RNA sequence: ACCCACUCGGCACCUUACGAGAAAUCAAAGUCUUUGGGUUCUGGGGGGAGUAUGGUCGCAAGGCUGAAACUUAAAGGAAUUGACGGAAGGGCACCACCAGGAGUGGAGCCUGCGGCUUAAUUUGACUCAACACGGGGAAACUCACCAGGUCCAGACACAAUAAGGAUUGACAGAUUGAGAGCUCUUUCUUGAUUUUGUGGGUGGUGGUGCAUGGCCGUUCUUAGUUGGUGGAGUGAUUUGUCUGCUUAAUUGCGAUAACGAACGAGACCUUAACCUACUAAAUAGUGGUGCUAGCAUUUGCUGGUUAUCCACUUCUUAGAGGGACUAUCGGUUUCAAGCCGAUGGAAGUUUGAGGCAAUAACAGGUCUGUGAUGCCCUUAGACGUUCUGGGCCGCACGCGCGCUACACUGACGGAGCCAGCGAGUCUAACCUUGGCCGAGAGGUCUUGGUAAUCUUGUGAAACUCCGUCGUGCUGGGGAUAGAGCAUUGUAAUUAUUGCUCUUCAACGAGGAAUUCCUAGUAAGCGCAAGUCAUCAGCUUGCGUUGAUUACGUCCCUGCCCUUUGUACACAC
């Protein structure tokens, strides 16, 4: 009970939990006129229709739906 | 009945026998099996001559 | 010369304790803490050491006289209880022998150890009392080992961050064994559930079995063990608890400073034997037949049928019992306990076999059974847990338990007919009849059975009847290998297992040594249950066929009791 070499690099790397940035959902700045949309949401009607859906690269991935959302896009 | 008990020190265990009455038994065998007891006889009075009890 | 009674003086002896003594013992070792009859010599813990030195005697060997330095906590006496003895006397044991049987040790293989090897080949146990044992027949898990990867399941309470956000989880890319966001440029998401430091927990098949409990093995399968009150001794302690005889037995008969008891033995409790005696029973078996089969109708023999009848428990089952207590005779014995014969009896080696089983112990095994545990260690890239792979199986070699054999008291093929123990499917599929397919292993459909009703008369095997083989490692043996089929499993490759064909090795009965066993016992034979998804060459039982040789002994190995000796007591 004293051997222990871990010949594999540090592996205590924990992952980031969206480090603390500017205020989010940033939906527009509009003088007394309709707040318009940006990254604006998808087409399944389970989200909420205001909720800023991710979207990448020609496709979209679903916060809330967490396993099973992908289009082609 | 055995038990254990934790001290400070470890665990201690203890060991009661008890050996009922055998009189108090109320379940099976009344007496050790090796327990033979005697039935005193009644003396009887003698007779030192035929006599017929009468109706 | 003897025999009596004295007497004086000797060598002694027996008994007892007035006494004495540490006791052993002592008529002196008494008349000595109630200390004094006279007198000589000697000793002052153990060694060094009867040495050195001086003296003196002697031819010499040596004798007499005779230290110290230094060293040391005990040496020593007498007894007690044990243990031990190549001590004695009794009594015993196939874990001893005797006479034998079957064997093991020799071969191949299967398993467990050691060593070697390795990333790991996890580990405990090493005479009896470790090595087919941890119910340990490990493919994954088991698993504790090794190569790696996640996850926290770090409770609960103190400060920071903290809804202008604690911090959760992510498809797809890179990375990775990997559809593990494990992690990482990339964005989304639930929200107080957590994150960070602190105290403190938790888990641990991590250590200690020499810190423990319990349990188990062993001492030790033998018969032994202990109070109370009396007796003995200053005492430890002893007597009781024993000279003798008997028993398997501190079992009894008895003897007797012991009497009265307790545990262990026995008794006891299960199991196997007997019941034509009671209760019985379409979940077991019995008889004329209702019905229907064959040779056969003389007036029989051999079968099938639950709802077609009645009666029975011989056999089967179980409950209540009875039976055997050595019963009755003969012989023997302080003419007792008992033992030995013979006749009955199912049973006459406490009827056979078990279960249970003193005191006191062992630093025996086990912390890897336990959420049974004290202390120590680790505790977040943890020794937790989990996932994927391996290892526990590796092979120069040594050892233990075993399986198969070396053969015609046989191998092979065909034919016959036989048991007993036991198990079986519920939030999941067990034992599986029968029909069909297949050479085989196996595959398909449902009624059968949660069970004396179905597997299952478990139609087992050894075994008997005919054949083939013919003393040739041969048709003995079937190790080692090649090809294929199937089954179990998510997964079989360093072959799970089975089957078909082929391959056809040592082994020609085994050295020194050594194991078990006295009647349905050994041995042979197979069957069922255990662990079992699959795997028995292993165990726990069961039944089938069923020898030799003993009815003893203490020679070897031990055991119990007594006596004895001991410089032993961590006890030869």
Do not use: W
């Not at chain 1, 087409?43 to 916060?63: I, Q």
């Not at chain 2, 009455?21 to 003396?43: F, H, M, N, Q």
């Amino acid at each position: 009970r004293k051997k222990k070499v871990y010949t594999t690099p540090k592996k205590i790397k924990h992952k980031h939990k969206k480090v603390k940035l500017a205020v989010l959902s940033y939906y527009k700045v509009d003088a007394e006129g309709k707040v318009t949309k940006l990254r604006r949401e998808c087409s399944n009607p389970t989200c909420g229709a205001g909720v800023f859906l991710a979207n990448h690269k020609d496709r979209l991935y679903c916060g809330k739906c967490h396993s099973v959302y992908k289009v082609n896009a | 009945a055995t038990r254990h008990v934790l001290m400070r020190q470890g665990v201690l265990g203890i060991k009661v026998k008890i050996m009922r009455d055998p009189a108090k038994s109320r379940t099976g065998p009344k007496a050790l099996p090796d327990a033979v007891t005697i039935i005193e006889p009644k003396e009887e009075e003698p007779i030192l001559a035929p006599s017929v009890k009468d109706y």
